[PDB]
Coordinates of C-alpha atoms in Angstrom, one line a residue:
X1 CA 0.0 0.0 0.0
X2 CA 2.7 2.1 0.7
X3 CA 3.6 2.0 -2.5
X4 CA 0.8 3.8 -3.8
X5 CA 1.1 6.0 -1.5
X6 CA 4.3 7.7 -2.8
X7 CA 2.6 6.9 -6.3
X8 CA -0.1 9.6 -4.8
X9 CA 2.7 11.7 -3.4
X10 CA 4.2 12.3 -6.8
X11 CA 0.8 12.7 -8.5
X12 CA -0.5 15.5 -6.1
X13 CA 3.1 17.3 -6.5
X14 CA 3.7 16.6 -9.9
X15 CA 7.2 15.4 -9.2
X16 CA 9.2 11.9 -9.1
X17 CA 10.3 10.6 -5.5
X18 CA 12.6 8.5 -4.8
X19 CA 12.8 6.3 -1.4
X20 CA 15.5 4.2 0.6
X21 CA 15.4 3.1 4.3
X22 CA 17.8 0.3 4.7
X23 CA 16.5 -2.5 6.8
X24 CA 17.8 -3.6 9.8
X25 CA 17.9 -5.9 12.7
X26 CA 13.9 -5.2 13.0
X27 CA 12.4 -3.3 10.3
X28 CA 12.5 -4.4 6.3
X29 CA 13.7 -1.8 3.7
X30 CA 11.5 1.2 2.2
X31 CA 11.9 1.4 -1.2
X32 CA 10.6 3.0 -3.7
X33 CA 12.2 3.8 -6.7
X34 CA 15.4 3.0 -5.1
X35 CA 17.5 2.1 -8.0
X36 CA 16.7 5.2 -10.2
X37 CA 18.7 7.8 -11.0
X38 CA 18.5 11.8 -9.5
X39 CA 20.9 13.9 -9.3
X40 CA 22.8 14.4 -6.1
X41 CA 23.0 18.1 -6.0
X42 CA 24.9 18.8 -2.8
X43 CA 23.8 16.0 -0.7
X44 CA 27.4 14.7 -2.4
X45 CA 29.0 16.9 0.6
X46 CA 28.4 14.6 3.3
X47 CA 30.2 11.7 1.6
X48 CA 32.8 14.3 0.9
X49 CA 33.8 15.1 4.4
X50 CA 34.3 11.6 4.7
X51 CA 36.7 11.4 1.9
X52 CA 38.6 14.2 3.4
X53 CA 38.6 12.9 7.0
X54 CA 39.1 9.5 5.6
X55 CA 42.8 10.1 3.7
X56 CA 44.3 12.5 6.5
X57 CA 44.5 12.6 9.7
X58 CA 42.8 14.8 12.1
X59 CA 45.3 17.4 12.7
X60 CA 44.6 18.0 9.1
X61 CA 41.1 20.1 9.7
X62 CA 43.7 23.0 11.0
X63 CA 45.0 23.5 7.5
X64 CA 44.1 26.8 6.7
X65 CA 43.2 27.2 2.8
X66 CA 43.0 30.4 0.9
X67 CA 40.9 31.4 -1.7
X68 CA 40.0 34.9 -3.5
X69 CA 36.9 36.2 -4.2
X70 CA 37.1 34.8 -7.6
X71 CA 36.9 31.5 -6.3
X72 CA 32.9 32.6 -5.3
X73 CA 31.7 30.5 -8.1
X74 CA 28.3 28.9 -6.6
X75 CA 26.3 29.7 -3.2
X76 CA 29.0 30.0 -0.5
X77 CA 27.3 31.6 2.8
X78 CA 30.3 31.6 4.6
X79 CA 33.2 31.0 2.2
X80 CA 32.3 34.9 0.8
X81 CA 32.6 36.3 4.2
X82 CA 36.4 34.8 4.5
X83 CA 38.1 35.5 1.7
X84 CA 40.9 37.9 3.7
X85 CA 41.9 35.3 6.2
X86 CA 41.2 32.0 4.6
X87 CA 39.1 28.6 6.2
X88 CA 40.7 25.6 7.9
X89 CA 39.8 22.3 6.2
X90 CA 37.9 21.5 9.4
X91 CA 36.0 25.3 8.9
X92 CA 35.2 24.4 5.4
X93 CA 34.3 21.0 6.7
X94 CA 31.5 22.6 8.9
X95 CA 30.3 25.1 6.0
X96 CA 30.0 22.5 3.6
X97 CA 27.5 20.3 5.2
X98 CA 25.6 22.9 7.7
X99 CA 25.6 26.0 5.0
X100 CA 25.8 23.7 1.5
X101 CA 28.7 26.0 1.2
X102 CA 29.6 25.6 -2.1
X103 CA 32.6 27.3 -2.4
X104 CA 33.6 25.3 0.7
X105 CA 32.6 22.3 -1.4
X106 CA 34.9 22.9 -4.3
X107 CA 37.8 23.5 -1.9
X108 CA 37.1 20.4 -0.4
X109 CA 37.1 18.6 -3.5
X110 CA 40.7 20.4 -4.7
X111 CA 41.5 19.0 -1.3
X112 CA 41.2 15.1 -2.4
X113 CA 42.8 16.3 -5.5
X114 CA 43.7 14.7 -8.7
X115 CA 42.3 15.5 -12.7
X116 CA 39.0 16.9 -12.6
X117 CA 39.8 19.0 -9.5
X118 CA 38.6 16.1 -7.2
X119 CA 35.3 14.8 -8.9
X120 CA 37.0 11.7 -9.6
X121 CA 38.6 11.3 -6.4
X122 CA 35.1 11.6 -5.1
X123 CA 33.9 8.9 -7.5
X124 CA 36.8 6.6 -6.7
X125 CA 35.8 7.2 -2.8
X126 CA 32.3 5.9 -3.3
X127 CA 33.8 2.7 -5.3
X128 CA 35.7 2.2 -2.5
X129 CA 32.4 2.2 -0.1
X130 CA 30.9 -0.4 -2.7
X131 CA 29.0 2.6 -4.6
X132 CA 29.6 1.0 -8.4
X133 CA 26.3 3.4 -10.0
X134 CA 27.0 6.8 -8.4
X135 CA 29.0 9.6 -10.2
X136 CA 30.5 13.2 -9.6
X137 CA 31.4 14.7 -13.1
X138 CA 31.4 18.3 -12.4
X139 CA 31.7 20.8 -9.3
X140 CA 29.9 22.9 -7.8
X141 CA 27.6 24.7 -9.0
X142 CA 27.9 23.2 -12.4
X143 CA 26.6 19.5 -11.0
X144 CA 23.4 20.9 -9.9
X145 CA 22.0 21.8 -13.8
X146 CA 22.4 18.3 -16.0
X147 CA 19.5 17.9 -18.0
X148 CA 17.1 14.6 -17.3
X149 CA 18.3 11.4 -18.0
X150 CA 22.2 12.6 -18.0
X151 CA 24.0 10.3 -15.5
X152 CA 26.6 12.6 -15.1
X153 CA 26.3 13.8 -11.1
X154 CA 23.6 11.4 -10.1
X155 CA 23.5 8.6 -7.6
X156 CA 20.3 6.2 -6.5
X157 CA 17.9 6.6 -3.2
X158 CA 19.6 2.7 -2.8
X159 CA 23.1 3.9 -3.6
X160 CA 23.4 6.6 -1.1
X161 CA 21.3 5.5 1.3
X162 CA 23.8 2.1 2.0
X163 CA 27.2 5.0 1.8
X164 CA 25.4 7.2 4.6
X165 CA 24.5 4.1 6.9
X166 CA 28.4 2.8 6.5
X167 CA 29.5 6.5 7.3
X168 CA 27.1 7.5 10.5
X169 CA 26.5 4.1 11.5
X170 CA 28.7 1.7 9.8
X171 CA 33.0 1.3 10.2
X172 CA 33.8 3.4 7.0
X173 CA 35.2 5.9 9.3
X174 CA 36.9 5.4 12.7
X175 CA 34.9 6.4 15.3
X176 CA 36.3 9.8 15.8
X177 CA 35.9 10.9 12.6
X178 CA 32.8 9.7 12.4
X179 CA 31.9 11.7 15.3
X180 CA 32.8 14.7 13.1
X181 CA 30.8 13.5 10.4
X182 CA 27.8 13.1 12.8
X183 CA 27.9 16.5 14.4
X184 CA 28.0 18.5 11.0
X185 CA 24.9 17.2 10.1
X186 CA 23.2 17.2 13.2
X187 CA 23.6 20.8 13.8
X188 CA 22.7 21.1 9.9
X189 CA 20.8 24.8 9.5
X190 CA 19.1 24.0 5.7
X191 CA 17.1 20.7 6.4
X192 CA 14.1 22.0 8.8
X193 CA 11.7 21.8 6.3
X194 CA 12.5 18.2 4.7
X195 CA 13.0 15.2 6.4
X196 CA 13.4 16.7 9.9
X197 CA 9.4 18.4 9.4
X198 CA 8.4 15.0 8.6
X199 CA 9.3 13.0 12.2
X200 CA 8.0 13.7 15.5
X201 CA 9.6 16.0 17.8
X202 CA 11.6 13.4 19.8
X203 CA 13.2 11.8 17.1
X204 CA 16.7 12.9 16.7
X205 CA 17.7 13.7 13.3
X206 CA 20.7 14.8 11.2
X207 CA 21.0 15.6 7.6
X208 CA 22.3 16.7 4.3
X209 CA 19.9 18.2 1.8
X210 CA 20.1 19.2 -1.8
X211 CA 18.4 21.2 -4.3
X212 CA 18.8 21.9 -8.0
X213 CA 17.3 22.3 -11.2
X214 CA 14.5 20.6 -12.8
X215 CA 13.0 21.4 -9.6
X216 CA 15.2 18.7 -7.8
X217 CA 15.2 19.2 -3.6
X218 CA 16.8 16.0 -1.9
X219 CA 17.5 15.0 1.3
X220 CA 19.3 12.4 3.5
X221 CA 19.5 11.7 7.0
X222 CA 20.0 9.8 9.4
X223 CA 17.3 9.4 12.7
X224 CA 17.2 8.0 15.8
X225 CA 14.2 6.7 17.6
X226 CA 12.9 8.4 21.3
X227 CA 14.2 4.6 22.8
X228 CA 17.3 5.2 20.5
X229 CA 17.3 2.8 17.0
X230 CA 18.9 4.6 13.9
X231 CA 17.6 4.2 10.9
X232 CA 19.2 6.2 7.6
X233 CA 16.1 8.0 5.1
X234 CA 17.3 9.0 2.0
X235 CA 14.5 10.6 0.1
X236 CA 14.6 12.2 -3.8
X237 CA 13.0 13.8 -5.6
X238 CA 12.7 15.6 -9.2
X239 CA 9.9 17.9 -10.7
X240 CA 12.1 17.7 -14.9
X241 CA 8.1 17.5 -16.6
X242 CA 8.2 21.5 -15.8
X243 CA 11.5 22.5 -17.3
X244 CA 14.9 23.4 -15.7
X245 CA 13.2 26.1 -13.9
X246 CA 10.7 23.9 -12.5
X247 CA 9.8 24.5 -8.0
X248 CA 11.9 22.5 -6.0
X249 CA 9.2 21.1 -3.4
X250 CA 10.8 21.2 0.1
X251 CA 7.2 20.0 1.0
X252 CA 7.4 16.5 -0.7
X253 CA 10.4 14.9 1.1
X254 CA 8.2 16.5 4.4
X255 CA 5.1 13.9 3.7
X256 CA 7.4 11.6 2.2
X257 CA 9.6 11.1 5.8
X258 CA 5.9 11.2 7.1
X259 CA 4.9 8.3 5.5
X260 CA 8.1 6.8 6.7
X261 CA 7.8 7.5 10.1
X262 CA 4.6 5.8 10.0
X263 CA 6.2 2.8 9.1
X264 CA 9.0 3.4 11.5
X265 CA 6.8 4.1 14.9

């Protein structure tokens, strides 16, 4: 039934949705249109933290990187407010994931390094998680704007839902860096209206959202029951039928965790 339910979701909001809650000791899998194809959009910066906390060590975050404000290529809250005295990797760590900075991003990405500025470093750090569909191709804010049915930049609701459970919850990362991992999203500041509107009050929640063209808002999370249980939500979606220009509808991944945490209680 649930099934349909989505299926009524994306009627009423004229969009495609896409579902993943991996199963676990006590619960079986939501899926629903796992293994289809959206476009990251910056929920890729979670996974990228990891690939930079991953390869270095931790005294690593105190690198300070500098930048000009040339480098202010995409939506950088904080990056453009620090262009005379630079970001640490661990400050650029924070704006990534709780401001989508995406200035920060890029930096972040140079930081893993290699041809491509660090989109392939990024793809060859999924790989290595067991990711073989996902792919980064371009940077920000270039990775938010490929047309439908390009699989450049895109992932699956499956894909990233299995990376984020090996991250938060999983052994990918020790446990202090994973720690770090945690925090940044839990003290997120642009998920309130997604995932996080969508589960009661005493449900902890953390998060990484996204939002793009083709009217493409996604987020994913991880949440923890009131006795305690995780479970990871990634949730999708795309609205390509109107155009490139096409509203992003925060409101959709909001009844979508909704149904989920039906199923969840």
């Amino acid at each position: 039934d649930l099934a349909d339910r989505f299926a009524e979701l994306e009627r009423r909001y004229d969009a495609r949705l896409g579902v993943y809650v991996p199963a676990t000791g006590t619960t079986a899998a939501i899926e629903y249109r796992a293994d289809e194809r959206f476009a990251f959009c910056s929920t890729f910066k979670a996974p990228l933290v990891a690939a930079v906390l991953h390869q270095n060590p931790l005294t690593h975050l105190d690198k300070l990187i500098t930048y000009t404000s040339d480098d202010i290529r995409s939506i950088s809250p904080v990056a453009q407010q620090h262009v005379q005295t630079g970001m640490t990797i661990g400050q650029l760590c924070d704006a990534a994931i709780r401001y989508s900075d995406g200035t920060a991003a890029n930096l972040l990405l140079a930081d893993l390094g290699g041809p491509g500025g660090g989109t392939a470093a990024f793809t060859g750090y999924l790989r290595s998680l067991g990711d073989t569909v996902s792919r980064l191709d371009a940077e920000e804010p270039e990775l938010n704007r490929d047309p439908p049915g390009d699989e450049r930049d895109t992932t699956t609701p499956h894909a990233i839902a299995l990376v984020l459970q090996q991250l938060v919850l999983g052994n990918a990362l020790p446990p202090d860096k994973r720690a770090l991992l945690t925090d940044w999203m839990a003290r997120n500041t642009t998920g309130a209206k997604r995932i996080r509107a969508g589960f009661p009050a005493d449900w902890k929640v953390i998060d990484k959202t996204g939002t793009g063209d083709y009217g493409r808002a996604n987020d994913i999370a991880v949440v923890w029951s009131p006795t305690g249980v995780p479970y990871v939500v990634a949730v999708m979606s795309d609205r390509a039928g109107g155009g490139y220009d096409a509203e992003p509808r925060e409101a959709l991944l909001a009844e979508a965790a909704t149904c989920v945490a039906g199923v969840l209680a």
